[PDB]
Design a protein around this ligand. Structure first.
Ligand SMILES: *[C@@H]1O[C@H](CO)[C@@H](O)[C@H](O)[C@H]1NC(C)=O
Lengths: 214, 224
């Protein structure tokens, strides 16, 4: 099958910008049998351009398609609010048709360090036999962030999960949750619980912590 | 104007089989439009499954022998319908399945190249979630305290749950995170709010949680 490798994985832009997204096919496509789609979070993709450069009926002309050698690129002029989201390229030169991995286009903003908070398990949860420790990172930009869990100073692996909101429509920031889960038994055993966060906005990795029972 | 209307969400046990449907409003006859089915696993890109073109059906290598695709012309009571049958479901079949249509009437169009094509109309998608879990209402736990506070909505199935604060009167500064799927095969999510530290003993905060598939509704007061 033909492989389509898409570039870059994410890019940040402003309203009114011109943006370029590229896709390299693993073989030449003489016929220009390539298509571009947009997908907004929660919705079905929409066809924007087909045959490399042809605009589908109803698609704004600020979208255009181009090709050179094995590379195909989508250009977006005068970037608009409804344009943000994820874009995919597709070859239909040879069976079966295949898609690129996709490109996320998000809103550019000044750097903002997360506000960081940590929540011990509630007494009600402890009563029901489980313990969840939650760390919150609120309203930060850019999205890239690392959070590590330490208990009794020991790095925690495989017992945590993270969740990230969509980029906020009004302040263009992200928020993120990390939840550390363990048995009521181990929770009651150890003393200090710590969330360690690293982010561009932070001159140095910030640690929020507590001692069980304070 | 073409609107493709797919059948609703299904929750299916491993080993089971399912059939998803697509009503093609605005489509004359599948003699003039090809149907292509496509799926998208969560946080993944898109993958071609198979097609029916000129009343001739077929499936990609990865799905051959496991999938039947059919289409029938109808009128009056219903528009033309296509369906996709999938046998022996496993966890890696969990995804959003899209039905898709492309006119084949004009050979010169450039939407299609000898049966391989771009997809000009899309359905909303249907989620097929493959799981042995049985329906279960959540537990709700307080996340007690500019300060932050919230609610942990733990161990429910299936999606979705909805969360408001103070019956909807508090919306500014509220973040309700996408659910995560735990190792137990049950979901969990949290909802948080940031508030001024000053009002903490003056103002009341309650999260209203609704899980309709289990008919569960809880109202949890969150206190310092
Ligand atoms: C699944 O289909 C396979 C062949 O694809 C067959 O051997 C098997 O019996 C089927 N499994 C079930 C549970 O029907």
């Amino acid at each position: 099958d033909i492989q389509m490798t898409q570039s870059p994985s994410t890019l940040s832009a402003s309203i009114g910008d011109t943006v370029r997204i590229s896709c390299r096919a693993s073989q030449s496509i003489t016929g220009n049998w390539v298509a571009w789609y947009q997908q907004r979070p929660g919705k079905a993709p929409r066809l924007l351009i087909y045959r490399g450069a042809a605009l589908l009926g109803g698609v704004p002309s600020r979208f255009s398609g181009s090709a050179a050698g094995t590379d195909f690129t989508l250009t977006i002029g005068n970037l608009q609010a409804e344009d943000f989201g994820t874009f995919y390229c597709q070859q239909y030169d040879t069976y079966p048709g295949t898609f690129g991995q996709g490109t996320k286009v998000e809103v550019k903003r000044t750097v903002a360090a997360p506000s960081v908070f940590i929540f011990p398990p509630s007494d009600e949860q402890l009563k029901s036999g489980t313990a969840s420790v939650v760390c919150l990172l609120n309203n930060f930009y850019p999205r890239e962030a690392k959070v590590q869990w330490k208990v009794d100073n020991a790095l925690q692996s495989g017992n945590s999960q993270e969740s990230v909101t969509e980029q906020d429509s009004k302040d263009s920031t992200y928020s993120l949750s990390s939840t550390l889960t363990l048995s009521k038994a181990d929770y009651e055993k150890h003393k200090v619980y710590a969330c360690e966060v690293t982010h561009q906005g932070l001159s140095s990795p910030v640690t929020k912590s507590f001692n069980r029972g304070e | 104007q073409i609107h493709l209307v797919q059948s609703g969400t299904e929750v299916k046990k491993p080993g089971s089989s399912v059939t998803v449907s697509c009503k093609a409003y605005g489509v004359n006859t599948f003699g003039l439009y090809a149907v292509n089915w496509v799926r998208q696993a969560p946080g993944q890109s898109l993958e071609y499954i198979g097609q029916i073109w000129r009343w001739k059906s077929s499936a990609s290598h990865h799905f051959r022998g496991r999938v039947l695709i059919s289409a029938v012309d109808l009128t009056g009571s219903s528009p033309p319908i296509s369906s996709l049958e999938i046998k022996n479901l496993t966890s890696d079949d969990t995804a959003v399945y899209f039905c898709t249509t492309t006119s084949t009437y004009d050979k010169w169009s450039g939407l299609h190249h000898d049966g391989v094509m771009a997809f000009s109309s899309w359905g909303q998608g249907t989620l097929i979630s493959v799981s042995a879990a049985s329906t279960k209402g959540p537990s709700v736990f307080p996340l007690a305290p500019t300060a932050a506070l919230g609610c942990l909505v733990k161990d429910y199935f299936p999606e979705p749950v909805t969360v408001s604060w103070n019956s909807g009167a508090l919306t500014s500064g509220v973040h309700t995170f996408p659910a995560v799927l735990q190792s137990s095969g049950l979901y969990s999510l949290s909802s948080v709010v940031t508030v001024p530290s000053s009002s903490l003993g003056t103002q009341t905060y309650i999260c209203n949680v609704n899980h309709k598939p289990s008919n569960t509704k809880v109202d949890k007061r969150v206190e310092p």
